[PDB]
Amino acid sequence: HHWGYGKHNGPEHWHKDFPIAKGERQSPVDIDTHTAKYDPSLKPLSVSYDQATSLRILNNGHAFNVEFDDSQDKAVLKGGPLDGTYRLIQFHFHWGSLDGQGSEHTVDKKKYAAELHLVHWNTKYGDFGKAVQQPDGLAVLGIFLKVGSAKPGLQKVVDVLDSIKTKGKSADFTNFDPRGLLPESLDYWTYPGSLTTPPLLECVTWIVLKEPISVSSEQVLKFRKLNFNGEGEPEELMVDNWRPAQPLKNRQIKASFK
Ligand SMILES: NS(=O)(=O)c1ccc(NC(=O)CN2C(=O)NC3(CCCCC3)C2=O)cc1
Ligand SMILES: [Zn+2]
Numbered sequence: 523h524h525w526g527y528g529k530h531n532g533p534e535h536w537h538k539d540f541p542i543a544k545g546e547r548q549s550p551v552d553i554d555t556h557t558a559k560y561d562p563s564l565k566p567l568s569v570s571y572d573q574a575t576s577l578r579i580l581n582n583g584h585a586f587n588v589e590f591d592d593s594q595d596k597a598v599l600k601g602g603p604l605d606g607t608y609r610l611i612q613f614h615f616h617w618g619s620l621d622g623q624g625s626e627h628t629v630d631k632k633k634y635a636a637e638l639h640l641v642h643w644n645t646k647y648g649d650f651g652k653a654v655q656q657p658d659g660l661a662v663l664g665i666f667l668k669v670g671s672a673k674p675g676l677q678k679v680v681d682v683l684d685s686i687k688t689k690g691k692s693a694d695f696t697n698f699d700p701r702g703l704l705p706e707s708l709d710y711w712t713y714p715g716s717l718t719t720p721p722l723l724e725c726v727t728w729i730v731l732k733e734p735i736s737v738s739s740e741q742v743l744k745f746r747k748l749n750f751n752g753e754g755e756p757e758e759l760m761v762d763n764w765r766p767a768q769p770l771k772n773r774q775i776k777a778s779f780k
Contacts, residue, residue, distance in 0.1 A: 525720045526584070526750065533765045540720045547724045548768040549715030550626035553775055558711055561776035567602035567708050567729070569663070569701075574610060576698035579682055583689030583750055584719060585614040585763055588679065588698060592643070592650075597700070599642045599661050602778065603712045603727055608642035608661040611650055613700060615639070616718070617745050619761040621669045624742075626718050626764045627730050629666070634734060635742055636667035637764070638703060639718075657714070659725040665705065666734035673737045675702020680744045688753040705733035709779040718765045732779070 525531055525539065537543035574597030578589045589612045590597060597610035617636035618624030625634035640663040643653040653659030667673075678698055685693045709732040716724045748760035 523720065527763050536720055536722065540722045542716070542722045542724060545716070545722070545724055546771050547714050547716055547773065548722065549718050549726060549728060550628070550765060550767055551713065551715065551770050551773070551775070552628045552631055552767040553711050553730065555630050558775040558777045560780045561712075561778070564603055564712070564776065564778050565601045567710065567778065568598075568600040569704065569708065570600070571597045571610065571699070571701050573597060574700055576695050576700075578692050579679070579686055579695040580692040581686040581689055581748060581760075583752070585616065585760070586683065586686060586748065587612040587614045588695055588700075595645065598645075599640075599663060599729075602710065602729055603776070604661055604729075605658070607645045609645055610640060610642050610700070613638060613640045613703070615667070615745065616764040617667075617742060617761065618764065619746065619759075621739070621742070623762065624764055625666055626766075627664055627666070627728075628767050634666040635669045636737070636745065638665040638667060638735075639663070640665075640700065640703075654717070654723050654725045656725055658727060660717075661727045661729060664728060664730040665703065666731070667737050667742070668734045669739050669742060670736035671738065672741055673703070673735050675699070676737055676741055680741050683744050683748055687747070688749045688751060688755075690752055703735065705731055705735050707731070707733040709733060709777075711775050711777055713773050713775045715773075
């Protein structure tokens, strides 16, 4: 794996090592708000993060992941388009070099400054590695970030980034409550898609919240001081780690709201 986000290893190159990059259910996509249709078959969405147990934060050279204890049903996502129980394993973000870009999904071609992905796996498949081989293996809850007021619940994340500046660095990150990253409304769009990085597996039910959260310019400037490189290597700022919108093909985006 030498994929990344540069001119020579970025999204336009991924197909050569990951041919599913040109597949029939790739993510992200543009959400055309006028074409998305309210779906009365959707059950109420249930985000149950009361017992979430965060463990560690890791710079993986592509983003940073806040990882959770997923050895039992502690933080789960259920309902909406989902059949059964999906366990939270990690969250991460995608962001830009400037405030007008960074999200992976777009809304009527609008790009947000960043996008939060809370990744969950379907417990009927027993472990994450089995779940990613299944068309309904994962559920990713996507939340847009706009630059405005600070998000108080983000600042514990922002303040540890200095300790994980480079690829392969991790830090203990216990007792973080991901409920502080949610907007007030759980109105959402949903469609079948993929992981947005290699290996681009078509295993994700995407649930993208309509209401962005606001973060401050200072908060997102701290994301942009991270590094794609390892320690001791030439500094390459971790910015623009987003895949652009992919063809919708034979898919419909469903809305939870009238
Ligand atoms: N942007 S995204 O679509 O939300 C998205 C994109 C890529 C990924 N990639 C992965 O999770 C890659 N990956 C595996 O396959 N296995 C582990 C998790 C389980 C333990 C072993 C390591 C892992 O980290 C996740 C979400
Ligand atoms: Zn992601």
